[model samples]
Target: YFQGMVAEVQKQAPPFKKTAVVDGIFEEISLEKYKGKYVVLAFVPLAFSFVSPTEIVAFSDAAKKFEDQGAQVLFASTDSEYSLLAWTNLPRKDGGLGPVKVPLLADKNHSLSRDYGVLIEKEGIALRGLFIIDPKGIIRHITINDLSVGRNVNEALRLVEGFQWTDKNGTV
Candidate 1:
């Protein structure tokens, strides 16, 4: 099953158009909009959850770092846009995501998650899946973790650097 999802790399990323919340505003975002740039899709389980908020906040804090590397970071989950908006407005002290700089994509229908092969059928939530797509829209790297574990932003950045390096030097 994992290998099947891994096959997605070197192929065009699964296309998706979904409603996302950014700084309390809702808007539609699609993979086509990110053409000619590296895209980072960070999949979390749910909004307002214990581990999800930490990862979301970390991704938010590192948004500029990703931008500096010419990459866009998108946080995706199975929650609705309204839920994302409400969570964005909630305070961190209350175990809610206060204000995330990165866009929180709502994969409410689970199409994105299912397409990405991260949807947990039993729970109806996504696992921690990360994908890095290149400028030409080919997937370059992927990392999927179980629900209990969190992802490392620096590692993802390193993968981005590796992809950029290989693209330039022909070897990583």
Candidate 2:
């Protein structure tokens, strides 16, 4: 299953380049940061909406698992830095996604989403696209779920681990 997704993603993904994203702090993030590591890039719909926070927090909670397997996670959305900061600063229990370890890139202009082919032109939003790019900066997995459903973070971690396992030992 993962192999098939990898094939599809590789056929579509372009080479990654350095780009700046505003998270808790303003910083530059790029494929170079994960040069020798696997990356989990997820595209959510919008901030301060229904369903988005759940997935974001889930991924944040599961980040340690991905890191333990030598992978990094990056999230992207069409929201601006101000919106991201507002959401990140809100307490988790208060319906706000707390500070997350992973950097959530702002696709405010939708350039990144357009590059990834996940941009919803009509809505100016992303279509819940999740991409797994390998150490070589090649996309290894891609899954775009429906706007209403919450994505499975554990499943994503499993996919990354599976890829790393096969890359290292020929099988998971």
Candidate 3:
């Protein structure tokens, strides 16, 4: 049986503890580490597929903006850390994510993906899912695309901006 994607806005985020490739070393990242800040998760269907780099680059380019907004962005996929490492090693023009700006979490075990409801069991891959979690661990926003189209980084940014205003975030 295949696992379907599921999520609800304002609901508590499914707990996650997974390892990701941070520049070079594999570091553990989790929701707990980002308390009192927003968490943005970008789920890629595959690491080295078409349209992947563009999306990744957009996120990388705006990574600082997200940080300035009091958020931490994490790039996630079904590929192994080694595979993610290989992608990071490749040149930008050669399907490698050259100088990715955020932690590229590997969900090869699929538990984290499943918990977030973005895992595609039939393909062992994830959809283009973006989740915005607030300081309190509640999922404030979520969007998922099919295996092809890419998402808008600016749109994600503005959504965070909107939420910050809506909730008067950071005052606490």
Candidate 4:
């Protein structure tokens, strides 16, 4: 529903303060809590499916690069945390996302997906939406891809650096 320009600042990202389970641990995570840090929200349709792990692992593999640049990556889906646990616990050789460093958020009700304009209402799935939120909580970049396609982790990392550069120099 949102068709905003790249540089045009969109409304402050809808605040989401919810419980997300990461590495078999349940912890509360919120957008407001990450106000001072750059955040990347990688929205996937489901867990334990084709193409999802490819993208998730891609992001996971690049975790240190993102962290080195002071950005946090979060993988979100409509699946429950239990599902996330089941998938992440599987070995990568078996098509499971093993030991992912990024938090896997459970958007069970699709509230977060809907707010981010990525939810597929009919199917109750998200369409691979990627958001680059700046340190001030303003969304600086967004890329929403259809279910079949995957996103480039390098591009997300590049955007984080670009956002940081613009934040400091006032230009991209």
The C-alpha TM-scores of every prediction are 0.93, 0.85, 0.91, 0.90
lDDT string, candidate 4, 1-172, tens digits: 2433222246577778766767778787998887888899888657777764667777888989988998999888999988888887888788777778888889998788888888888988988889988878788888988777778998898889987887789966
lDDT of 3: 0.84
Q: Residue 53 lDDT in model 2?
A: 71
Per-model RMSD to reference = 2.9, 4.4, 3.7, 3.4
- Model with the higher TM-score, candidate 1 or 3: 1
lDDT of 3 by residue, 6-115 (tens): 56687788777888899877999987899899999889757667664678888988999999998899999989998888888888877678778899998889887777
The number of clashing residue pairs in model 1 is 0
Predicted structure 2: lDDT: 0.77
The C-alpha lDDT values of all candidates are 0.86, 0.77, 0.84, 0.81
Determine which window of 10 residues in candidate 1 has minimal summed lDDT.
1-10
Candidate order by lDDT, decreasing, is 1, 3, 4, 2
Q: Give the backbone clash total of model 2.
A: 0
Per-candidate clashes, comma-separated? 0, 0, 0, 0
Give the deviation of candidate 1 from the true structure as CA RMSD. 2.9
The parts of candidate 3 lying over 4 Å away from their true place are 1-6, 169-172
lDDT of 1 by residue, 19-134 (tens): 99977899999989999779999997577676646677788899999999989999999999999898888888876789889889999998888888888888899889999999
Over 4 Å off, model 2: 1-8, 15-23
Q: Is candidate 1 or candidate 4 better by lDDT?
A: 1
Residue pairs of candidate 1 with colliding backbone atoms: none
